[PDB]
Write an enzyme that holds these catalytic residues in place. Sequence first.
Site, mmCIF file in Angstrom:
data_model
loop_
_atom_site.group_PDB
_atom_site.id
_atom_site.type_symbol
_atom_site.label_atom_id
_atom_site.label_comp_id
_atom_site.label_asym_id
_atom_site.label_seq_id
_atom_site.Cartn_x
_atom_site.Cartn_y
_atom_site.Cartn_z
ATOM 1 C CB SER A 1 -1.017 -0.008 1.155
ATOM 2 O OG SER A 1 -0.364 0.080 2.421
ATOM 3 C CG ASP B 1 7.502 -6.960 2.991
ATOM 4 O OD1 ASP B 1 7.403 -8.215 3.122
ATOM 5 O OD2 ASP B 1 6.525 -6.259 2.612
ATOM 6 C CD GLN C 1 -3.911 -1.748 3.485
ATOM 7 O OE1 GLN C 1 -4.087 -2.471 2.496
ATOM 8 N NE2 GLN C 1 -2.757 -1.707 4.148
HETATM 9 N N1 LIG Z 1 -1.397 7.151 12.086
HETATM 10 C C1 LIG Z 1 -1.766 5.848 12.089
HETATM 11 N N2 LIG Z 1 -2.408 5.290 13.115
HETATM 12 C C2 LIG Z 1 -2.797 3.999 13.126
HETATM 13 N N3 LIG Z 1 -2.527 3.143 12.118
HETATM 14 C C3 LIG Z 1 -1.871 3.579 11.018
HETATM 15 C C4 LIG Z 1 -1.443 4.987 10.939
HETATM 16 N N4 LIG Z 1 -0.817 5.163 9.763
HETATM 17 C C5 LIG Z 1 -0.846 3.942 9.139
HETATM 18 N N5 LIG Z 1 -1.457 3.004 9.881
HETATM 19 C C6 LIG Z 1 -1.669 1.575 9.502
HETATM 20 O O1 LIG Z 1 -0.502 1.053 8.830
HETATM 21 C C7 LIG Z 1 -0.856 0.344 7.684
HETATM 22 C C8 LIG Z 1 0.314 0.329 6.715
HETATM 23 O O2 LIG Z 1 1.406 -0.265 7.414
HETATM 24 P P1 LIG Z 1 2.766 -0.519 6.579
HETATM 25 O O3 LIG Z 1 3.655 -1.287 7.572
HETATM 26 O O4 LIG Z 1 3.344 0.720 5.893
HETATM 27 O O5 LIG Z 1 2.125 -1.495 5.461
HETATM 28 P P2 LIG Z 1 2.722 -2.005 4.033
HETATM 29 O O6 LIG Z 1 4.234 -2.017 4.133
HETATM 30 O O7 LIG Z 1 2.301 -0.912 3.027
HETATM 31 O O8 LIG Z 1 2.009 -3.297 3.886
HETATM 32 P P3 LIG Z 1 2.786 -4.772 3.510
HETATM 33 O O9 LIG Z 1 1.790 -5.708 3.003
HETATM 34 O O10 LIG Z 1 3.814 -4.424 2.468
HETATM 35 O O11 LIG Z 1 3.437 -5.241 4.777
HETATM 36 C C9 LIG Z 1 -2.050 1.143 7.169
HETATM 37 O O12 LIG Z 1 -2.907 0.282 6.461
HETATM 38 C C10 LIG Z 1 -2.772 1.512 8.468
HETATM 39 O O13 LIG Z 1 -3.713 0.489 8.828
HETATM 40 O O1 LIG Z 2 3.965 -11.498 -0.593
HETATM 41 C C1 LIG Z 2 2.658 -11.423 -0.039
HETATM 42 C C2 LIG Z 2 2.710 -11.158 1.451
HETATM 43 O O2 LIG Z 2 3.214 -9.753 1.659
HETATM 44 C C3 LIG Z 2 4.133 -9.826 2.757
HETATM 45 O O3 LIG Z 2 5.469 -9.807 2.204
HETATM 46 C C4 LIG Z 2 3.886 -8.573 3.661
HETATM 47 O O4 LIG Z 2 4.148 -7.402 2.841
HETATM 48 C C5 LIG Z 2 3.924 -11.185 3.464
HETATM 49 O O5 LIG Z 2 5.089 -11.581 4.254
HETATM 50 C C6 LIG Z 2 3.663 -12.085 2.279
HETATM 51 O O6 LIG Z 2 3.015 -13.311 2.675
#
Ligand SMILES: [N]C1=N[C]=NC2=C1N=[C]N2[C]1O[C]([C]OP([O])(=O)OP([O])([O])=O[P-](=O)([O-])[O-])[C]([O])[C]1[O]
Ligand SMILES: OC[C@@H]1O[C@@](O)(CO)[C@H](O)[C@H]1O
Length: 479
Positions: free
Chosen positions: A13, A236, A303
């Site tokens: 996001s 990440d 979201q």
């Molecule tokens: N100011 C405030 N208070 C409470 N809560 C919150 C605020 N700002 C924001 N927030 C939350 O967070 C989320 C986002 O987180 P981050 O760690 O930046 O995520 P990303 O990296 O874009 O995702 P992934 O799948 O790549 O891990 C928003 O939605 C809200 O709920």
């Molecule tokens: O890749 C899809 C999903 O996104 C993340 O990397 C969080 O950003 C999770 O660890 C994975 O399961």
Amino acid sequence: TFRNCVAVDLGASSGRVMLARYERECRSLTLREIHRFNNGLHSQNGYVTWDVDSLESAIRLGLNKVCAAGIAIDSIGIDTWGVDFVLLDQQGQRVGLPVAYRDSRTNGLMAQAQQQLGKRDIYQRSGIQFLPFNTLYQLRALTEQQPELIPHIAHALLMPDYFSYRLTGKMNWEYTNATTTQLVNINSDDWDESLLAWSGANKAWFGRPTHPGNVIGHWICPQGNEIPVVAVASHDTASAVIASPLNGSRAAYLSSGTWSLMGFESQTPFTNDTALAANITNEGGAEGRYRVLKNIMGLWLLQRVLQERQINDLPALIAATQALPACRFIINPNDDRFINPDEMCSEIQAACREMAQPIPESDAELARCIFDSLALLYADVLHELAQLRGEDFSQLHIVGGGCQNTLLNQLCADACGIRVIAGPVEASTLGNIGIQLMTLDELNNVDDFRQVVSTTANLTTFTPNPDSEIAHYVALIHS
Ligand SMILES: [N]C1=N[C]=NC2=C1N=[C]N2[C]1O[C]([C]OP([O])(=O)OP([O])([O])=O[P-](=O)([O-])[O-])[C]([O])[C]1[O]
Ligand SMILES: OC[C@@H]1O[C@@](O)(CO)[C@H](O)[C@H]1O
């Protein structure tokens, strides 16, 4: 002698280019935002995709800001969300679209793999949780549904290595993110031939996965001094875990953004029947410390509600939601129906109605449903993880943008009955920086970096409240 390291952290996001300033002698670590930009799914030609060209331009914009400022960049590193990839031809041009993990192209394919290959077989080879959009299944979709693309493919790069390539002209296959694919054998740390065979991908599209810390290549500020691009723990969540100020074996993490990733660290994976039944994952971590965790659908639900109801003051929403009674609306956020419904509020309401529950309708009611349903799932998963490893937790570290939600922080501490420590917010950025410093010989290991974070970042304690509504609710469900 202070080092200036730039971390690129791309989430589902949001994207950010951040600049850290570090020096060993002082144990001083600062983080400044250089460029923050939106990221999000794009509907393109009947597909849900990423706009990778706009993401690259955004990344370059951030990098060039630091350059034009005259700052001496010591290194750059990139982390992104897992699973997703970009296909490239022999000349480095993209093949097909950069399809997102939220695309429905994979529907049915996880079941098919379990039927053809064996559920237990895939799990023992990969140690990775079953998620319908795992790379294993995306590549099946690609090769089954777009056979005309196949001859053109020279390489598949996971998202972070894609951008690292776009910067350096060099390709990399980073271990921590490779593990998210459900294509890496947990015993060899290399691509599993049988899983690649089923997916229709070719082993020559990849390279042997490489542990973080290597210099991928170099980038050039428009004047021309070579800046090393380092392979960090490029998943990440792997980065966020590095920055979580974990205090020994009884601490767990909750990496809270679009997804909530709740888990612990282990020197050994859990691929037993207990782990399989709970659908626990063993994702690759820095130092080879497995991130034994479960995916939780997370703030993605919120979201979507925010977009549908056109709510633009999240802090106000959270504040209003605090006034609402807890646990009258409970859904299971991990239900597949919430991955990418066209109508999120409608889907939430349907799920509640199917259970003869009151219908959450106001903005605050929908947020209340989401927060309570996450906290109850947090408590379930934390119990499963403790049960699995045979060791309790004394603290939960919540990190990520979601750790700014003080309501959810307290509901989590209350439901789980565990002390919660929230912070740092930008944990993925910080873990990205941490790995660069290690490559620069400015930092010795992850545990040392956590001491820096713990004495540097803002950490807020939430103490479990046993007399809370959700505590009351949970005590009751136990019997
Ligand atoms: N100011 C405030 N208070 C409470 N809560 C919150 C605020 N700002 C924001 N927030 C939350 O967070 C989320 C986002 O987180 P981050 O760690 O930046 O995520 P990303 O990296 O874009 O995702 P992934 O799948 O790549 O891990 C928003 O939605 C809200 O709920
Ligand atoms: O890749 C899809 C999903 O996104 C993340 O990397 C969080 O950003 C999770 O660890 C994975 O399961």
